[PDB]
Design a protein around this nucleic acid. Structure first.
Ligand SMILES: [Mg+2]
Ligand SMILES: [Mg+2]
Ligand SMILES: [Mg+2]
Ligand SMILES: [Mg+2]
Ligand SMILES: [Mg+2]
Ligand SMILES: [Mg+2]
Ligand SMILES: [Mg+2]
Ligand SMILES: [Mg+2]
Ligand SMILES: [Mg+2]
Ligand SMILES: [Mg+2]
Ligand SMILES: [Mg+2]
Ligand SMILES: [Mg+2]
Ligand SMILES: [Mg+2]
Ligand SMILES: [Mg+2]
Ligand SMILES: [Mg+2]
Ligand SMILES: [Mg+2]
Ligand SMILES: [Mg+2]
Ligand SMILES: [Mg+2]
Ligand SMILES: [Mg+2]
Ligand SMILES: [Mg+2]
Ligand SMILES: [Mg+2]
Ligand SMILES: [Mg+2]
Ligand SMILES: [Mg+2]
Ligand SMILES: [Mg+2]
Ligand SMILES: [Mg+2]
Ligand SMILES: [Mg+2]
Ligand SMILES: [Mg+2]
Ligand SMILES: [Mg+2]
Ligand SMILES: [Mg+2]
Ligand SMILES: [Mg+2]
Ligand SMILES: [Mg+2]
Ligand SMILES: [Mg+2]
Ligand SMILES: [Mg+2]
Ligand SMILES: [Mg+2]
Ligand SMILES: [Mg+2]
Ligand SMILES: [Mg+2]
Ligand SMILES: [Mg+2]
Ligand SMILES: [Mg+2]
Ligand SMILES: [Mg+2]
Ligand SMILES: [Mg+2]
Ligand SMILES: [Mg+2]
Ligand SMILES: [Mg+2]
Ligand SMILES: [Mg+2]
Ligand SMILES: [Mg+2]
Ligand SMILES: [Mg+2]
Lengths: 273, 65
RNA sequence: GAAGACUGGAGUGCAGAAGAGGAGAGUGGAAUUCCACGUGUAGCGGUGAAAUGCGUAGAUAUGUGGAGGAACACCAGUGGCGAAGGCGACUCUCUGGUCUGUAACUGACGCUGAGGCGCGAAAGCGUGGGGAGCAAACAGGAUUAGAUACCCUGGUAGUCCACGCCGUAAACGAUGAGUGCUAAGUGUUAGGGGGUUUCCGCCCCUUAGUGCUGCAGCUAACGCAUUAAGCACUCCGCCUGGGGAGUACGACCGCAAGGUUGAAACUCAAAGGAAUUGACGGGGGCCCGCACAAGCGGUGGAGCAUGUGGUUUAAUUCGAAGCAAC
């Protein structure tokens, strides 16, 4: 659920958090950990290209199975764990062989169940199927775009997509952002909504807690100097004395569409959000 | 008039006896009021539950024609 | 008051019956909406009239399939259940009460109940899901002298679900709970006993509910009348002319809106219930009249006589003002 804190201090007045009730264990699978290093938005050349990054708690990558290409082997759910590298939780799965892999824990997944991948798998939560085998109307996640690559499309916490109809070599799908998109029928997907549905209700409550996740302060352009931002300068507080609000590099920022006007995948999108 | 069930003494209305129930429905599957078939109140209630049960298992039509 | 005794009040046992009484978990079929794909062409919708609105990126219509939410057609009945609010699709689990017969058992164990504790339509509040129709606020088009409304097209909170608050209503039978006594007639719901009868069926007696009509009696009247507003006994709540006013102050409760308790100064000579006789209604029935219809012929058109208004003048003497002045 969501845990509230009593206002014993001013920095904990409105802070809320998760109770981590669905997490089973606390020790990761040592054979599936890889190191990460913070980049802080720094570039190939050492320059700062993306700002407001860097300086948080150190983490450790643990490899997730997005491909889901182990077919015909029953797999038992062992634990449900915590992954700092993503919003959703993850579930450790040990197949009958003795091979252990991580997946994205869907809603309703619990310890003791069994999941399958392939063409004979049932329409059940956690199973992975090719889109040509999934009946119309079901709720799916972890959609992949190119066959054999791995799931890319719907992966965040508490997100879902729905199959609308099949029309030949392609399949219509309404993505989480609300657009009807057309993708191949040989791609794979996983049935069910993604797990940690309550992630969006959390109140940070502190500036330091925001700093713990690796965020640096954001300075509004209106308090900068004329050579620093198009909004800068002016005696006293000044309004946006321009035709339109501007990004730090020009290029109006309020309503101005930035998608390329000659994109190749324009024909595979039916309607936009 | 005359209660059909009481006249013939039948005291158990069952949903499997699909041939009996079809007498008390209209040509469309609607149940008929007890002031047309003349059945007594205590047995109209039993009749209505049995028809609703057997409507569910495709033994009788919900709307027919 | 104390000690005994009893069974009719009260409760238990035994045998039967009916029920939208409650909570949880599943499931079903009609229909409005949306989506995908067939056919088809220029309309669709709406009103007292019209416009906004949707439609050639091809609708309304039509056939197939899918998604999702909400309410449960016929049965349905001054029928049923519940202490009140209230409860209508189907199945299962967990549960509360009630009625009839028996006379097996205890032997007054009963009634009412200030403070207290619980339940309590709809709106509304807090955290979070869900969102098909409907729709405060709102936007546009109409209507009107104006229209911050009724009408038309959309539309958010809300209506739905989980948990926690709120504590109110024309929460009404405008009728507190318990008990006994006091003519009849007739429907209906759930039972029991008996006569006739091969069953079927008709009749009589009886218990507990639910309606109608009526005597004694009661009432200001309307009306109530074995489901009393009749005749009596026990306990509880409330009233003492209208406004100020369910207001102010104090207190308790609430996240908030608010809820419960609750006056006085001042002011008026009335406020009020029921029934009667008229009058009126953009209430309803029936009858009549050159009132309409069926006719014949005029007026309004053109030219003049003529009365009124208007207007111009020193005066253009006064009175008439739809029908009912000209
Ligand atoms: Mg930033
Ligand atoms: Mg995480
Ligand atoms: Mg400065
Ligand atoms: Mg500049
Ligand atoms: Mg400036
Ligand atoms: Mg200045
Ligand atoms: Mg007794
Ligand atoms: Mg029930
Ligand atoms: Mg159509
Ligand atoms: Mg009752
Ligand atoms: Mg004895
Ligand atoms: Mg009591
Ligand atoms: Mg009290
Ligand atoms: Mg409500
Ligand atoms: Mg509407
Ligand atoms: Mg009250
Ligand atoms: Mg009521
Ligand atoms: Mg009553
Ligand atoms: Mg009252
Ligand atoms: Mg009274
Ligand atoms: Mg009294
Ligand atoms: Mg009394
Ligand atoms: Mg009595
Ligand atoms: Mg009495
Ligand atoms: Mg009776
Ligand atoms: Mg009798
Ligand atoms: Mg009863
Ligand atoms: Mg009676
Ligand atoms: Mg009296
Ligand atoms: Mg009467
Ligand atoms: Mg009596
Ligand atoms: Mg009564
Ligand atoms: Mg009285
Ligand atoms: Mg008093
Ligand atoms: Mg007074
Ligand atoms: Mg006074
Ligand atoms: Mg009167
Ligand atoms: Mg005429
Ligand atoms: Mg003629
Ligand atoms: Mg004529
Ligand atoms: Mg003529
Ligand atoms: Mg002439
Ligand atoms: Mg004159
Ligand atoms: Mg005059
Ligand atoms: Mg007149």
């Amino acid at each position: 659920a969501i845990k509230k804190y009593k206002p014993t201090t001013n920095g904990r007045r409105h802070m809320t958090s998760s109770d981590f009730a669905e997490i089973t264990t606390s020790t990761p699978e040592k054979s599936l950990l890889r190191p990460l290093k913070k980049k802080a938005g720094r570039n190939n050349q050492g320059k700062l290209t993306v700002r407001h990054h860097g300086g948080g708690h150190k983490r450790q990558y643990r490899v997730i199975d997005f491909k889901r290409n182990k077919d015909g082997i029953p797999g038992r759910v062992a634990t449900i764990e915590y992954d700092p590298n993503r919003s959703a939780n993850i579930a450790l799965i040990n197949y009958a062989d003795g091979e252990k892999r991580y997946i994205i824990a869907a809603k309703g997944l619990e310890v003791g169940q069994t999941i399958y991948s392939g063409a004979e798998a049932d329409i059940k939560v956690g199973n992975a199927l090719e889109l040509k085998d999934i009946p119309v109307g079901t709720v799916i996640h972890n959609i992949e775009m190119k066959p054999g690559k791995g799931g890319q499309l719907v992966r965040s916490a508490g997100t879902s997509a729905q199959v609308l109809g099949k029309e030949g070599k392609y399949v219509l799908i309404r993505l989480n952002s609300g657009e009807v998109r057309m993708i191949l029928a040989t791609c794979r997907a996983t049935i069910g909504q993604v797990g940690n549905e309550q992630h969006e209700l959390i109140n940070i409550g502190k500036a330091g807690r925001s700093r713990w996740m690796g965020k640096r302060p954001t300075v509004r352009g209106s308090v900068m100097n004329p050579n620093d931002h198009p909004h800068g300068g002016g005696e006293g507080k000044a309004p946006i004395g321009r035709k339109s609000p501007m990004s730090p590099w020009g290029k109006p920022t309020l309503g101005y569409k930035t998608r390329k006007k000659n994109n190749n995948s324009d024909k595979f999108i039916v309607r936009r959000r | 008039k005359v209660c059909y069930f009481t006249s013939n003494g039948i005291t158990h209305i069952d949903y499997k006896d699909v041939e009996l129930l079809k007498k008390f429905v209209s040509e469309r599957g609607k149940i008929l009021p007890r002031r047309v078939t003349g059945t007594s109140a205590k047995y109209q209630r039993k009749l209505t539950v049995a028809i609703k049960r057997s409507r569910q298992m495709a033994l009788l039509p919900f709307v027919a024609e």
